[PDB]
Amino acid sequence: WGYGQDDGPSHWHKLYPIAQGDRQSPINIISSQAVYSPSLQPLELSYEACMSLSITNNGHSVQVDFNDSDDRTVVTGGPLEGPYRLKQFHFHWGKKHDVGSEHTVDGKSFPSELHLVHWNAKKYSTFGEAASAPDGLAVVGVFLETGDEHPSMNRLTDALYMVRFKGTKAQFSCFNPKSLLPASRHYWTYPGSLTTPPLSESVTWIVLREPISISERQMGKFRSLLFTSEDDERIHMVNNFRPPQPLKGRVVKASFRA
Ligand SMILES: NS(=O)(=O)c1ccc(C(=O)N2CCC(O)(c3ccccc3)CC2)cc1
Ligand SMILES: [Zn+2]
Numbered sequence: 001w002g003y004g005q006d007d008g009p010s011h012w013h014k015l016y017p018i019a020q021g022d023r024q025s026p027i028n029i030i031s032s033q034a035v036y037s038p039s040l041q042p043l044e045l046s047y048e049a050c051m052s053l054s055i056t057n058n059g060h061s062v063q064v065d066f067n068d069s070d071d072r073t074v075v076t077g078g079p080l081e082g083p084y085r086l087k088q089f090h091f092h093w094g095k096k097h098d099v100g101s102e103h104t105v106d107g108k109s110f111p112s113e114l115h116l117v118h119w120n121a122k123k124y125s126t127f128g129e130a131a132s133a134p135d136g137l138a139v140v141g142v143f144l145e146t147g148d149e150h151p152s153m154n155r156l157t158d159a160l161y162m163v164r165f166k167g168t169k170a171q172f173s174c175f176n177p178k179s180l181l182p183a184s185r186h187y188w189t190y191p192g193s194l195t196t197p198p199l200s201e202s203v204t205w206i207v208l209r210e211p212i213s214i215s216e217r218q219m220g221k222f223r224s225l226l227f228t229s230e231d232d233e234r235i236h237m238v239n240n241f242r243p244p245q246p247l248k249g250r251v252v253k254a255s256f257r258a
Contacts, residue, residue, distance in 0.1 A: 001197045002060070002227070004235075009242040016197045023201040024245035025192030026102035027252070034188055034254035043078035043185045043206065043255065045116075045140065047086065049176040055159050056169035060196060061240055062160060062225055063090035064172055068121065073177070075118045075138055078206055078255065079189045084118035084138040087127050089177055091115070091144075092195075092241040093222050101143055102195050102241045103207050110211055111219060112144035113241070114180055115195075131194065136202040140187075142180065143211035150214040152179035157214075157221040165230040182210035186256040195242045209256065 001007050001015060013019035051073045053065045065088045066073055073086040093112035094100025101113035118138045119130040130136030155175055162170045186209040193201040225237040 003240045016199050018199050021201055022248045023191050025195050026244055028104045028244040029188050031106055031258045034252045036257050037253040040255055041077045044076050046074055047178040048072040050174040052172050052175040054169050055172035057163040057166055059166040061090040063088050079204055080138055082122055085121045086118050089116045095238040104244055110143040111146050114142040116140040132200050133202050138204045141207040145211045145213045146216045146219050147213040153214045153218050157218045160221045164225050166228055182212050184210040188252055188254050190250050190252045
């Protein structure tokens with residue numbers, strides 16, 4: 001599978017039937033339909049500054065992996081009943097400002113979306129094991145808009161050149177994912193799924209209301225990445241996102257009042 005004309009999202013159902021399930025992600029968030037839920041506890045992202053291991057171009061996105069041996073980088077609160085350990089973060093982006101995010105809000109897309117993937121290491125032995133259970137994952141999504149340069153983001157965008165080709169990785173020590181979070185912790189939450197095959201419906205989604213912004217120059221470093229390997233016809237990594245999927249009666253909760 002991929003994001004091309006022949007193996008893109010519109011065809012994934014041909015290989016993974018769960019693509020047509022009842023709790024698929026992403027979704028179009030209709031702010032007015034979101035249910036304000038004051039019962040939800042405060043969302044807390046407790047991240048350490050040196051838990052990052054490497055940065056990798058895996059052919060589908062650029063991903064930063066973390067040491068998840070313990071609870072030094074976890075997400076807790078909000079709709080979560082316990083702590084989920086951060087395994088990795090990656091991005092989805094487009095070829096222009098009007099497209100790139102997976103989730104959309106009132107029909108609006110952002111040029112990119114950051115996904116911080118956490119797993120329930122309290123009740124599952126492996127990240128892979130958790131990826132298959134309904135309460136296995138918790139992914140925090142952050143929208144990226146283009147505008148002013150993002151200082152901390154430079155550490156990451158400067159590192160992209162060395163992983164521009166599919167299958168290449170580099171050491172990426174002491175990068176604090178907290179540096180990519182907005183000043184607000186308000187969010188929307190709903191039960192969903194992985195947005196890439198196997199598309200298992202094991203994710204509790206937490207989409208932050210406030211986007212962070214990076215410069216167009218910074219965004220351009222992402223579009224410079226390649227879907228292809230070094231010895232192949234260069235195909236730039238762009239539009240690596242899955243479009244919104246049917247809500248199917250699911251309830252979208254919000255931690256704030258629109
Ligand atoms: N965009 S997303 O939904 O936030 C997301 C979440 C996890 C992953 C992930 O960790 N991947 C993809 C799924 C994966 O390939 C897999 C394979 C088989 C079983 C379970 C997971 C493991 C690696 C990728 C994207
Ligand atoms: Zn993702």
